[PDB]
Structure formats: C-alpha cells, structure tokens
Amino acid sequence: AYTTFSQTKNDQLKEPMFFGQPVNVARYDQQKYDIFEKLIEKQLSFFWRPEEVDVSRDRIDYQALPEHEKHIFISNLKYQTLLDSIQGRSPNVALLPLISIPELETWVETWAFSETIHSRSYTHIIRNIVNDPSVVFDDIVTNEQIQKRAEGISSYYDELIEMTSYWHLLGEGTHTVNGKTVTVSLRELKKKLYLCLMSVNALEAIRFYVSFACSFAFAERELMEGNAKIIRLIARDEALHLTGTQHMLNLLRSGADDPEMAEIAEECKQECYDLFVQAAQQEKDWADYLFRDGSMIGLNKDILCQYVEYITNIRMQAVGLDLPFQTRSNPIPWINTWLV
Amino acid sequence: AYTTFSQTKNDQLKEPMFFGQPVNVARYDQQKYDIFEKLIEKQLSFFWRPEEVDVSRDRIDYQALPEHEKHIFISNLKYQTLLDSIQGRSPNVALLPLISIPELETWVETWAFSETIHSRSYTHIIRNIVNDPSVVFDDIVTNEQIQKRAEGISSYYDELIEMTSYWHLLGEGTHTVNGKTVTVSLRELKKKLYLCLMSVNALEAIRFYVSFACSFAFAERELMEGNAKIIRLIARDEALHLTGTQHMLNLLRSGADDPEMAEIAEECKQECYDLFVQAAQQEKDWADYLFRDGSMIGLNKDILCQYVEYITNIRMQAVGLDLPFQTRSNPIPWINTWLVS
Ligand SMILES: [Hg+2]
Ligand SMILES: [Hg+2]
Ligand SMILES: [Hg+2]
Ligand SMILES: [Hg+2]
Ligand SMILES: [Hg+2]
Ligand SMILES: [Hg+2]
Ligand SMILES: [Hg+2]
Ligand SMILES: [Hg+2]
Ligand SMILES: [Hg+2]
Ligand SMILES: [Hg+2]
Ligand SMILES: [Hg+2]
Ligand SMILES: [Hg+2]
Ligand SMILES: [Hg+2]
Ligand SMILES: [Hg+2]
Ligand SMILES: [Mn+2]
Ligand SMILES: [Mn+2]
Ligand SMILES: [Mn+2]
Ligand SMILES: [Mn+2]
C-alpha cells in the first residue's frame, strides 16, 4: 500500500512526520519543521571527499605502533566501519518508507548518503595502512566481540522493516497467513519505529563518540593524523545526525506531531531508558577485548568506562530521560580539542 | 528475510548484482564491477549546490514571455520536478533491498542522493520565478497531462516493491493470505526488476532528455539562463545515471552475472520494446499538447517528435533492442552545446 508517488493532492504541512501519506512532490519552499531543512543545508555545506585526505604518513605511523596499540587502533576502526556500513543503508531501507513530510524524507536520504562517505573514508584509511584490507573487512563480519558489542542494532532495524512490510501489504487487522494468525497493529508499529529512533539516537550519540575518543587518543600522541582529520570530519557529521534524531524524538514527545506518538513516547519511557542502559553496558564490555593485549597511557578500561557514563548521562538528559549514572566531570577533557 | 547486516562471511566479488546475500560490510577497495565505483567517484566529483546559481534574471524573462511560452516552460519544469521527486526516493526504496554487491548499493544511494539535489534546484528556480510556489507545486500531483505523460512510472516501482515484500516475508511458493492464494515466484520478481530497470533507463535516458531540449531552447534565445545553468548540471548528472542503468541492464542480459536474468531478458524482448515505444509515444503526446496554444522559437511539435525518435533509437540500441524509428541524424544538434558529456 506503499507508493512512490501518492496521487492525492495533500497539504504536506499537516501530515505527521511518520505514517501519514507517502510524500509525492519533493519541495523545499516550506516545511512543517524547518529544523530538517536546516540540517540538510548544513550537511551539504559540510560535503567532503575522503580520498583527498592525506593518509600517506599513517602507514609509517601505524606499522611503528607496538602490537597492542595496532590492536586497539584497528579493533576500533573495524567497529566504526561496521556501524557506518549499517547506517549507510538502514535509514533508507527502514525509515524512508514511513516518512510523510518532504523535509524529513530528504534529510534521511542525505544523512544516509553522508554515512556512505564515512564508509568510503574507512576504506581509504584501511587500504593505506595494511597490506591486505580483506583480512580487516572479513573480520568485521566474523569477529564475535565486534558483533557482541553491536548486538541489537541490525535486529531492531530488521524487525521494523518486516513489520512495515506486513503493514503496507496487509493493512491493520488480524490476518491468516499460511494458516498462522498474524496481527498488524499500527500502534505497535509506531512503537517499533519510535524505539528504533531512540536506538539510533544511542548509536550516534554514544557508541560513535566512544569510538571517536579511542581514535583521538592516537591523535593526542601526534600519530595517525590522516585518520584524525577524517574522524574529525566524521564527528562533525555525526553531531548533525544526532541533532536530527534528538529533534525527531523531542518533537514526537511534545504532542505537536502525531498525538499517538506523544502517548507512546510517555508509555514506552522505561524501554527508552533500558535501551540506553544496555548500550552503555555493551560499550563497557568491549573494553575487555579492546585492551586484551595491554592498554595505553590515558586510555584503558577504567577511563573508557568513566567516559561512557559521562556521555550517556548527557545524551539521555537531552531527550528527557532520567540519568542512570553518578554525575561526573568529563574524564577526558582533551577530547574537546578534536570535537570543535 | 532481508537483513541490514548479513552475518555470513561471503565473497562479495562472487555475489550477483541482485537477489544474492544482502550486503554486510560496505568496502570500496575491490569490486566485482568497477563501473559502479567509477560512477560513485565521478558523481561525487560533480557535487554542486543549486543556491550557488544565480537565477535573479529568470523572473523578468519568464514574465515577459508570451503566455503560451510561459505554459511550455512551466509545464516542462513541473514534469522535471515530478520525475526527480520519484527518482529521489525510488531507487533507494525499490532497489536497495535487492542489491547484493557493495559498489552497486552505494552507487544507488549516491545516485538517489544526487536526485534530491535536483529536486532542491527546482525549488530554487520556482521560488525565484513565481510569487507563490504553491501554485506550481500543487499542480504537479493532479495535473492531468503530467499524470498522462508519466503514467506508469510509479506503478513499475510500486509493483516491484510489493512483490519484493512478499518475497522477503514468505519466500518462494504458493501461499494463502486471508482466503486467497498468493504465489511468489523468484523468476517473476527477476522479471519485474528487469522491466523496472529498463523503465528507469527510459526515464533518465529519454524522458529527461526531451525535457532538456525544451529548457535549452530558451537558453539558446538567451532567456531563462539561471534555469539553463541548473539544467546543464542536472544533465551532466543524468548522463552518469543512464550510464549506470545501461551497464546494469547489459550485465544482466549478457548472462555474465545471473544466467537466469539472461534468459529472462531474451524472454521479454518484445514487451521491453513495446514499453520503450510507449514511453516515446507519451513524450510525443506531451509535445503535441504543449505546442497547441502555439509554437516556440526554435522548437515545435514536429521537431520535438523527431528528437524523441532520434534519442529513443540511440538508447534502445545501447541496451540491445531493435530500432523502432527511421534513422536520422540529430534534428537539433545545437543541443549538444548544453549537453556536456
Ligand atoms: Hg533502529
Ligand atoms: Hg575510547
Ligand atoms: Hg522515551
Ligand atoms: Hg565507570
Ligand atoms: Hg526500477
Ligand atoms: Hg521502475
Ligand atoms: Hg519539451
Ligand atoms: Hg520549451
Ligand atoms: Hg523538447
Ligand atoms: Hg523485458
Ligand atoms: Hg521475461
Ligand atoms: Hg530486453
Ligand atoms: Hg523496456
Ligand atoms: Hg515522435
Ligand atoms: Mn557515520
Ligand atoms: Mn551518523
Ligand atoms: Mn535528476
Ligand atoms: Mn537521474
């Protein structure tokens, strides 16, 4: 029941962000929420080409690092690669089919496009610091500890996509599919979308920032400067991506968009809280693998754990959630040099 | 049965373009078909911003145009706007779920993204030539002649998407849903993808090019020059987009990628031909109506009809189809001035 060009002349300023009539005409002369048009303009103003970045000195620097530091650096980089591989396709496959205002539709496509640039930047780094990129990329798929840390991201998206297909194909109601009773509830699908957004918020707001701190620890040592320039550019894009999901979520919570979404945000509040607590614990658990062969001055499991707590509280407060962790000052204030 | 991250380590150089294992790692250090990596690189190198183009004199040119010429210009722009609105979302929603090699997956996202820039540029033009853009944007959805010229485009994508959902949800076989039999066949879904791609090839390679003739006819008269600069950049992008679908279609019909797709292509050779001819016919009908209130300087319904027949022959030959029209040389060689590429 999805269509690539809905034939009803509708007032796009009055549709909800999600689940209304699919967008027909892509126009940018007006917006229900100008924040998405501002985000598109800012992301386009940030356009960068990874291949232009000089990473010729990173190979010298990398091969010079002691073995445990190569492990820390590459294990981090493989996780960034996994996340952006998922973020390049998922907003388009999972969110695009449910969007009903043009400014949010184009924002999601722009945001997903910018993630493919990040992926292309990891290939640029990887091909220039190791002799066989294939060993690095293949490990991303099979590495148990990497998958463990990301557990639940692809699951969430996949479940939303499957429920969306049932909805678009069958409509609301209880159906009989190959003899099994299948319930399609729009309210349940709105909850699934809503929690998928909260999960994406945690992914960009927390998981990527923990990874940035690990990358910048090398830059503070005056090493892997090509990587650092790229991570700085990637972080600048991620700041916009998380601004986008924070606004989607806070707008839904306000009751100014779909009223049912404001009810759902309030009703599913413990689940929001729980998914942030679980993601933080996963980022902490990654330290055992990250520092398996030794830690570095200023970067070890304890510092990583303190920073996870610090940044999780900040991101949760930004979308209205209670704080799970003891408050603390930033354990790694040197990161502010790199996050500009 | 689709996943955003397939957990099976697979050799991405050996998957088919479509229907294989969904792409897990996005890497660009190797590819099965390097044409898609070359297209991504070229499209990224062509990045442009509509707001960077001065359209300040287009308002006065448009206003001084005779009424039938305003009608020609605006009707043509509304159709370009409809086509890129569809092209901004559709390659992503329709093709991404079926791609199994990374370079093609990123090419599609890059191609679709470049179309949103086109849509943004039409807003930049429209806002700068009319008092109230809403009059122009609302007429796109229900404009009778526009619907007639673009008739069928959304239905091909829509049917492909629907059949893809059934396939991912239920898999191949004879199923039942609420008392009715629903048959899912991978062969039929491959055929729907093949025809959808042939239609996208006609959209970008013939429908858009006919619209470019209209826009550049004004540029030749030194009018609507802001619009001209923007259509020039859009046409440079479209040359890449059609290069991408020509390669997808030729790799599918040659049999080098999926033997079954080669058998399918041969099997719908006649259908594909008649659809191409139908697209050409819709474009002629649009011209006939558009030049009803009066011809323009340097363009009329017959000249445009010849251009449609000329470009249709070239594009059909490029994807191995027989030529439907009498061969002729380009009836409007001046257009080459504007079609870099
Ligand atoms: Hg999600
Ligand atoms: Hg870290
Ligand atoms: Hg919440
Ligand atoms: Hg801690
Ligand atoms: Hg298609
Ligand atoms: Hg199509
Ligand atoms: Hg025309
Ligand atoms: Hg014209
Ligand atoms: Hg024309
Ligand atoms: Hg065909
Ligand atoms: Hg066929
Ligand atoms: Hg064919
Ligand atoms: Hg065709
Ligand atoms: Hg014709
Ligand atoms: Mn990213
Ligand atoms: Mn991001
Ligand atoms: Mn376009
Ligand atoms: Mn195009």
From Swiss-Prot, chain A:
Q: Name one GO biological process term.
A: nucleobase-containing small molecule interconversion
User: Which cofactor is essential here?
Assistant: Fe cation
Residues given in the record as Fe cation 1 binding sites: D84, E115, H118
Query: How many cofactors are bound and how?
Result: Binds 2 iron ions per subunit.
Q: What is its EC number?
A: 1.17.4.1
Instruction: Look up keyword Coiled coil and say if it applies.
Output: no
Gene Ontology cellular-component annotations: cytoplasm; cytosol; ribonucleoside-diphosphate reductase complex
Give the binding site residues for Fe cation 2: E115, E204, E238, H241
Does Metal-binding count among this protein's keywords? yes
> Coiled coil: which residue ranges?
none
Matching InterPro entries, A to Z?
Ferritin-like_SF, RNR-like, RNR_small, RNR_small_AS, RNR_small_fam
Catalytic residues identified in the record: Y122
Name the Pfam families for this protein.
Answer: Ribonuc_red_sm
**Which chemical reaction does it catalyze?**
a 2'-deoxyribonucleoside 5'-diphosphate + [thioredoxin]-disulfide + H2O = a ribonucleoside 5'-diphosphate + [thioredoxin]-dithiol
Q: What CDD domains does the entry give? A: RNRR2
Keywords carried by this UniProt record: Deoxyribonucleotide synthesis, Iron, Metal-binding, Oxidoreductase
Which cysteines pair up through disulfides? They are none
Q: How does it assemble?
A: Tetramer of two alpha (R1) and two beta (R2) subunits. The B1 protein is a dimer of alpha subunits. A radical transfer pathway occurs between Tyr-122 of R2 and R1.
More about this protein: E.coli produces two separate class I enzymes. This one is the functional enzyme during growth.
Q: What is this protein called?
A: Ribonucleoside-diphosphate reductase 1 subunit beta
Upper classification of the source organism reads: Bacteria, Pseudomonadati, Pseudomonadota, Gammaproteobacteria, Enterobacterales
